[PDB]
Amino acid sequence: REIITLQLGQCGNQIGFEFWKQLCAEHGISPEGIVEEFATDRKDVFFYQADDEHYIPRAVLLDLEPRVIHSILNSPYAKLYNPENIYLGNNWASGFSQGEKIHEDIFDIIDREADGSDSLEGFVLCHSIAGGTGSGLGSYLLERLNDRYPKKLVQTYSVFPNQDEDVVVQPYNSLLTLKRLTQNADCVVVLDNTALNRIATDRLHIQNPSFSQINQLVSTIMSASTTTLRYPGYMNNDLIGLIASLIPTPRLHFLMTGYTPLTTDKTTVLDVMRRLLQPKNVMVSTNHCYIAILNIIQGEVDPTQVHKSLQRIRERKLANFIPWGPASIQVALSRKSPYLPSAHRVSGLMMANHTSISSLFERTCRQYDKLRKREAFLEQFRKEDMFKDNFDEMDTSREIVQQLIDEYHAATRPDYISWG
Amino acid sequence: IHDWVYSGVFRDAYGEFMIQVKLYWTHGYVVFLKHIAHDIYVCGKTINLLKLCVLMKRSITAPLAAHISLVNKAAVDYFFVELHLEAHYEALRHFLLMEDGEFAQSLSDLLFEKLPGELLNPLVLNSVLSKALQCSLHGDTPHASNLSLALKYLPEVPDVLSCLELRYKVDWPLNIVITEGCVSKYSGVFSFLLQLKLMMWALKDVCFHLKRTAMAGSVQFRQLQLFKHEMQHFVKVIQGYIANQILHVTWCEFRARLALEEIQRAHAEYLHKAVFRGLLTEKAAPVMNVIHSIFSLVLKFRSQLHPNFALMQQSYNTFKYYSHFLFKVVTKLVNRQPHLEDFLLRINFNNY
């Protein structure tokens, strides 16, 4: 059903605008919203059911001090959506306080779009971890949505920040935002800028327009994640049916992503299964076994050979898995999307709950603990000091992520029949 | 022979023609080669229907069978280019087999509010279909007409039971191809699919009861969710087995085999393969016998809804016992299939 998309921060507004351009080019949509002469499919997931099928995206843009929003403005895709839901520092404290002072009218924008919608099923946050203006503001405002609407689902698209540390409060910003992602969000998809830049230098020799290329990558990711909804498929036409298979524990909602064609410039399903089982098709960088793996595929397949593919991949025993419990690898299939150029016809995408991300969390834990012991990298924000005199919110987040690391490592153990 | 095939009027003088002649059919089948006799018997009834719209046979059968092929190809083409036979299957699949996104989860959810003194009269069953059909936007075919929500038993009643009839009605020149016994067999598998939707609704109900209390993220809370994820894995992986056998590997054939009696036997072989790989046959009956115990336990797990925390833990343990019990008896019956090889993957990865 009806899901309202949230874009915020410089990075989040970038991939949100790119993804809306992707869905405008993808379906039979003009740059004005007009249904084209080649448009059928399910068109009410983010698309406003207008009379002449002006499929207006449910896209709420809220930031302050607009820079990239001006670049969004001089475009014909500012005529695709505008139900007047577009709204005009880089620290957690500054963004937090700026979100605090104007929370009411932007939440009125939220409420107007909410009652204007037929239903509400999820909040999709276009974001990046410590995204400058996105950080602080997004954690605050995410707390406002989670308090204000406890009956909805939260998926947060963000990337792991790698800017080669310059802001020195970035582990604090990511730590507090990660606390809010634990307690005010039900799904967080994070990706490594390092591994994506490695794949970009792998397939081609371009790494310099990294923003533009990464918009293509995560726009392919998000269109592939919603393709079963936006084109008539069979299952995971709800977000919640997709989320339920991944999560055995509502604090372990952090998923690894991989994509089977690394070049775009076909063959059977067993082959792409073996490809995706390799960790070099993964977009993300002791012993770690997955909790549950699920794959979406789109392309030209043999409908009987997918049975044979699962049969051979099983009897190969090409993976490990976790001691505690019967899960599986899970196959999901949908159509190859029409009305775009179709190169490398099989494109697969994987969502897996892996314990390897606890090491990445521990890296940020060690960075935060190091800068905390040194205590010269908070820069004494007055907004942070009046917000928290003792800075024990960071201590509480470090406690939360440590409890999650403990849950990760006891889930690696067969004693997750007992407590983790 | 030269009358009934060409002019299209059946001919018999003294009753020495073997063939002799309600709905339309009154013909009765009860030297020459018998390989052409049944061909004459069917090549006449076709032409009769187009009007309403050394001793060897080498000098006889060659100018005779050359027209039988023409009559047969006109007959088979009459189905496709006029009745749109190829569209009917990929349309009935949408609704009857519930191959429709946001239709099954919109119809079943409304049905289970009653299951009861509702869903008796025809103004609530007559309105409940049109609310599910609008939520999907797959219709506006003439197969969204002839949809008929009905029943064979009214709702007056551990208890996982639900049943419903849903039919697509058919007129006469299609009744001989897609019969009213075949639509009933779609209803026969449809009952099982709807019964599964009841479980996907009950576990969703206890999942929504826990959804609203999140405030609470305590030890007793997460340990409860650990129960749910386990049962839901089983339910979705067995639904994936159904969505494999009855919906992928059988769905490849009979749109590649489709590219007068033979069309009927092709449909009847198609569905016979669909019921066989789907394990509802008597050969794979004990595999099906265990599933209702698991269903009963999932409904029990919803019923407790804490001072019954140990009770819910006990029901989860009974689910684990029967789930590991199923894998032994299906391993035991590998020696009694290629599709049953797929079943072991769904039930076991390292469940042993």
From Swiss-Prot, chain A:
Gene Ontology process terms (BP): cytoplasmic microtubule organization; meiotic spindle organization; microtubule cytoskeleton organization; microtubule nucleation; mitotic cell cycle; mitotic sister chromatid segregation; mitotic spindle organization
Main location per the UniProt record: cytoplasm
Pfam family for this entry, one: Tubulin_C
Keyword Magnesium: no
Record: residues binding GTP: 130-136
InterPro entries, sorted: Gamma_tubulin, Tub_FtsZ_C, Tubulin, Tubulin/FtsZ-like_C, Tubulin/FtsZ_2-layer-sand-dom, Tubulin/FtsZ_GTPase_sf, Tubulin_C, Tubulin_CS
PROSITE patterns: TUBULIN
Effect recorded for residue 360 to P: In CDCBM4; the chaperonin-dependent folding and hence the yield of monomeric gamma-tubulin is compromised
Family to which the UniProt record says this protein belongs: Belongs to the tubulin family.
Name of the protein in question: Tubulin gamma-1 chain
Gene source species: Homo sapiens
Swiss-Prot record, chain B:
Name of the gene encoding the protein in the UniProt record: TUBGCP6
Residue numbers of the full-length protein present here: 536 to 1815 of 1819
Similarity field: Belongs to the TUBGCP family.
Disease implicated: Microcephaly and chorioretinopathy, autosomal recessive, 1: A syndrome characterized by microcephaly, cognitive impairment, underdeveloped retina and choroid, and epilepsy in some patients. The more anterior parts of the retina, near the periphery and pars plana, have a grayish hue and diminutive vasculature similar to retinopathy of prematurity. Visual impairment becomes evident during the first year of life.
Quaternary structure, from the entry: Component of the gamma-tubulin ring complex (gTuRC) consisting of TUBGCP2, TUBGCP3, TUBGCP4, TUBGCP5 and TUBGCP6 and gamma-tubulin TUBG1 or TUBG2. TUBGCP2, TUBGCP3, TUBGCP4, TUBGCP5 and TUBGCP6 assemble in a 5:5:2:1:1 stoichiometry; each is associated with a gamma-tubulin, thereby arranging 14 gamma-tubulins in a helical manner. Gamma-tubulin at the first position is blocked by TUBGCP3 at the last position, allowing 13 protafilaments to grow into a microtubule.
Name of the protein in question: Gamma-tubulin complex component 6
Annotated compartments: Cytoplasm, Cytoskeleton, Microtubule organizing center, Centrosome
Function: Component of the gamma-tubulin ring complex (gTuRC) which mediates microtubule nucleation. The gTuRC regulates the minus-end nucleation of alpha-beta tubulin heterodimers that grow into microtubule protafilaments, a critical step in centrosome duplication and spindle formation.
Organism ancestry: Eukaryota, Metazoa, Chordata, Craniata, Vertebrata
